[PDB]
């Protein structure tokens, strides 16, 4: 689907048996989601953005169905104000910017 | 032009007679740029991100040519790690997400 940018590009995702809403974010290199239990194990990690840095749990080879499109990749879990679909997963579903 | 997301969607922008490189960011509602000298008055403001909040200078009605497409809108100047073109300006040049 083509998404206009007049509103926040929010999409419905399926991850770990849970339904959430995430922002298709071309400005994010990594996918970052609010707290949840993503089975499979993890390794501590720190990521930075506007305002500073946050500590996240790096989960790898994690499945996510983004708006009906399936993808597997690294998924950072931590205190993000919001869920973010990063370029690591956007490339897998064939997302592109168009102007 | 169509931009794949295998790499950062970086574009060259022209603002206030200066050439810079900015990240086409669909996750941003407004445009925020690193330190620079923007002629005009401004208004203090506070904006939030993953790591917290930063203080920026709100400049209004600022012309910016993004990849040859001209647009006018608010441009926030502050301690952002990278220049980001937000949705306030992406809509003006006709940007859309396609997957
Ligand atoms: C509410 C959604 C979201 C925040 C939860 C908004 N952000 C836009 C995201 O696209 C940012 C962009 C970025 C920010 C940055 F510091 C450095 C970068 F290189 C890139 N990505 C991000 O933090 O990404 C991180 C995860 O992946 C990693 O890769 C990039 C670095 C790491 S914002 O920049 O805070 C912002 C932009 C405009 C405006 C506001 C806030 C309010 C006022 C105005 O509307």
Strand B31-33 with B69-77, pairing: parallel
CATH number of B1-99: 2.40.70.10
How many angstroms is the resolution?
1.9
Among candidate residues A90, A87, A97, the one with its CA nearest the CA of residue A67: A90
Q: Do B8 and A29 touch (CB under 8 A)?
A: yes
Alpha-carbon gap: B17 to the closest alpha carbon of chain A (Å): 23
What is the token pair recorded at A54? 């946050």
Q: What are phi and psi of B52, to 5 degrees?
A: 140, -140
Q: What's the rounded Cα separation, in Å, for the pair A96 and A17?
A: 27
CA dist B91 and B83 (Å) reads 17
C-alpha span between A5 and B92 (Å, rounded): 10
Annotated domain spans of chain B: 1-99
Contact B74, B58 (CB under 8 A): yes
Contact A94 B91 (CB under 8 A): no
CA–CA separation, A13 and A19 (whole Å) = 6
Q: Record the tokens describing residue A62, joined without a space.
A: 């994690």
Concatenating the DSSP letter of every residue in chain A gives -EEESSS--EEEEEETTEEEEEEE-TT-SS-EE-S---TT--EEEEEEETTEEEEEEEEEEEEEEETTEEEEEEEEES--SS-EE-HHHHTTTT-EEE-
| Other beta carbons within 10 Å of B58 | 16
Give the mutation candidate from A10, A66, A99 for the B interface (greatest B CB count, under 10 A).
A99
CA distance B46 to B66: 25
**Residues of chain A neighbouring B8 (CB-CB closer than 8 A):** 29, 87
The DSSP annotation for chain B comes to: -EEESSS--EEEEEETTEEEEEEE-TT-SSEEE-S----S--EEEEEE-SS-EEEEEEEEEEEEEETTEEEEEEEEES--SS-EE-HHHHTTTT-EEE-
Tell me how far apart the alpha carbons of residues B47 and B40 are, in angstroms, rounded to a whole number: 21
User: Which residue matches tokens 């939030």?
Assistant: B48
Indicate if ligand 1 lies below 6 Å from the C-beta of A29: yes
């Amino acid at each position: 689907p083509q998404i206009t940018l007049w509103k926040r590009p929010l999409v419905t995702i399926k991850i770990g048996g849970q339904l959430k809403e995430a922002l298709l974010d071309t400005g994010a290199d990594d996918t970052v989601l609010e707290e949840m239990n993503l089975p499979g194990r993890w390794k501590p990690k720190m990521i930075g953005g506007i305002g500073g840095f946050i500590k996240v749990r790096q989960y790898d080879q994690i499945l996510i169905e983004i708006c009906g499109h399936k993808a597997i990749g690294t998924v950072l879990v931590g205190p993000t104000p919001v869920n973010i679909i990063g370029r690591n997963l956007l490339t897998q579903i064939g997302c592109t910017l168009n102007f």
